Amino acid sequence: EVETFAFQAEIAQLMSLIINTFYSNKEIFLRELISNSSDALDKIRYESLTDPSKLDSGKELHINLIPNKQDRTLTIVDTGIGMTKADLINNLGTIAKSGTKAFMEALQAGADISMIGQFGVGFYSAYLVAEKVTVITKHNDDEQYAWESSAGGSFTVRTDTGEPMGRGTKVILHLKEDQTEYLEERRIKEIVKKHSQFIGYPITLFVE
Amino acid sequence: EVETFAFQAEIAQLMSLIINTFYSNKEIFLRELISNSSDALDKIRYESLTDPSKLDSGKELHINLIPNKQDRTLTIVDTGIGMTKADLINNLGTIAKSGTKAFMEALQAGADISMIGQFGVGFYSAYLVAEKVTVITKHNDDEQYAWESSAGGSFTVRTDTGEPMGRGTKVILHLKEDQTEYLEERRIKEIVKKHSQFIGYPITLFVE
Numbered sequence: 001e002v003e004t005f006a007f008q009a010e011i012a013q014l015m016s017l018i019i020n021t022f023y024s025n026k027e028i029f030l031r032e033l034i035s036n037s038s039d040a041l042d043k044i045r046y047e048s049l050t051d052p053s054k055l056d057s058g059k060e061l062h063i064n065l066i067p068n069k070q071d072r073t074l075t076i077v078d079t080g081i082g083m084t085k086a087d088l089i090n091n092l093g094t095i096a097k098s099g100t101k102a103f104m105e106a107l108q109a110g111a112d113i114s115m116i117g118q119f120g121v122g123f124y125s126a127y128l129v130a131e132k133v134t135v136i137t138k139h140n141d142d143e144q145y146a147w148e149s150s151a152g153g154s155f156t157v158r159t160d161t162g163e164p165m166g167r168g169t170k171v172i173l174h175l176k177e178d179q180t181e182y183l184e185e186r187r188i189k190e191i192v193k194k195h196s197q198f199i200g201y202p203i204t205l206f207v208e
Numbered sequence: 209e210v211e212t213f214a215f216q217a218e219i220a221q222l223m224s225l226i227i228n229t230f231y232s233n234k235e236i237f238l239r240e241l242i243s244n245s246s247d248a249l250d251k252i253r254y255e256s257l258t259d260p261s262k263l264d265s266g267k268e269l270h271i272n273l274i275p276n277k278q279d280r281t282l283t284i285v286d287t288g289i290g291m292t293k294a295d296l297i298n299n300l301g302t303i304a305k306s307g308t309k310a311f312m313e314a315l316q317a318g319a320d321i322s323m324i325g326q327f328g329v330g331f332y333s334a335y336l337v338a339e340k341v342t343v344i345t346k347h348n349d350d351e352q353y354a355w356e357s358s359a360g361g362s363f364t365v366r367t368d369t370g371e372p373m374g375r376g377t378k379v380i381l382h383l384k385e386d387q388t389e390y391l392e393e394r395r396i397k398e399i400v401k402k403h404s405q406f407i408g409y410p411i412t413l414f415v416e
């Protein structure tokens with residue numbers, strides 16, 4: 001059923017830093033998620049060159065941004081390579097530890113939170129706007145998994161008995177009460193135009 | 209022996225654009241090569257988590273910058289994942305085609321050559337400073353290969369009968385006559401400090 005894991009100490013520390021530090025420029029989270037989606041789309045596109053059977057789970061390579069004012073969620077959907085259970089746990093992860101240490105060191109040296117992506121830990125910027133993050137993922141070599149964290153030093157991983165998604169990753173941002181601007185059409189459009197204008201995949205902003 | 213290949217039409221076009229366009233800010237090439245080295249180092253570091261036998265070919269994860277005023281070359285050495293023969297040909301490549309089209313489209317829309325890396329074709333910025341590029345590569349699943357191009361619409365690939373390198377990629381920039389500043393200690397140091405200050409691997413600048 002539901003497995004509960006402790007984040008590595010440095011990741012828990014980074015997450016607390018992101019939740020507690022005063023930082024108004026919260027919009028940067030979106031560029032980080034779109035960039036990770038783009039990297040996962042590049043990964044499946046690269047593997048499909050030698051083995052074309054990897055596109056059987058889905059041909060379309062895109063990113064959908066889905067605001068839901070009722071549920072107070074902003075969903076980032078991609079049809080990238082997706083993640084295995086091993087990737088959900090082992091990845092972010094030991095690889096994150098190095099980047100986390102270097103980013104926190106840089107912050108003491110006068111650096112800004114907007115430079116988080118340069119340390120491979122850009123995803124954690126989601127906690128600038130979200131009280132909880134749910135990640136639904138599907139990789140060709142594994143089943144559909146659900147990862148979840150409200151930070152607090154832990155995360156959960158469970159098999160997803162929900163609706164199948166073929167292949168890719170869905171990031172569901174359960175927004176904080178005072179961060180509902182990231183559900184507005186004009187606001188999302190402005191951020192995408194400013195930070196994600198040169199992404200090599202269609203980005204569709206859904207409307208309600 | 210030596211196999212000669214034609215670049216895809218769009219890549220040949222991009223390379224001619226890089227060689228012929230007037231653009232003074234040529235130093236950007238170094239950030240692009242260091243960034244690709246860093247990505248290949250991340251790749252071997254990630255694969256070594258599940259399979260630790262991948263580090264048998266080399267434990268140290270670093271980048272060396274080697275200027276040679278006699279040969280008029282600047283060498284960028286990394287101990288990253290390296291490339292197979294298939295990667296040297298098939299990669300840069302079909303994946304490059306999309307990024308090339310998007311980058312040339314962006315340039316017409318008022319964009320700058322410094323944004324090349326955002327389209328996954330950053331390596332081609334080497335031709336801002338180099339008349340010829342030699343690439344020596346070693347991946348765990350293949351033999352040692354040598355890739356070479358003076359642009360002009362073609363490249364060569366041959367098995368490398370030279371000195372083995374264990375694992376990684378070596379980029380040898382045969383600099384243009386008027387681009388010898390990229391061999392100076394103070395100049396390389398300045399560029400590394402300005403553009404590559406937050407790379408998560410040691411960068412060693414060799415001296416002569």
Ligand SMILES: Cc1ccccc1-n1c(-c2cc(C(=O)N(C)Cc3cccs3)c(O)cc2O)n[nH]c1=O
Binds near residue numbers: 039082
């Ligand atoms: C692993 C990764 C790192 C860097 C770029 C891409 C990937 N990546 C992804 C992917 C990851 C993230 C991401 O960072 N999430 C969800 C945070 C996580 C929580 C728990 C585990 S990871 C994302 O926002 C969208 C994505 O498409 N799919 N496949 C793949 O390789």
Ligand SMILES: Cc1ccccc1-n1c(-c2cc(C(=O)N(C)Cc3cccs3)c(O)cc2O)n[nH]c1=O
Binds near residue numbers: 241247286288300376
């Ligand atoms: C393929 C790639 C793309 C993006 C980042 C890393 C890689 N990469 C590399 C690698 C590539 C380049 C590079 O771009 N070169 C040499 C141009 C080329 C000419 C002919 C073929 S590629 C480099 O400067 C250093 C590197 O360590 N090794 N392993 C791996 O995956």
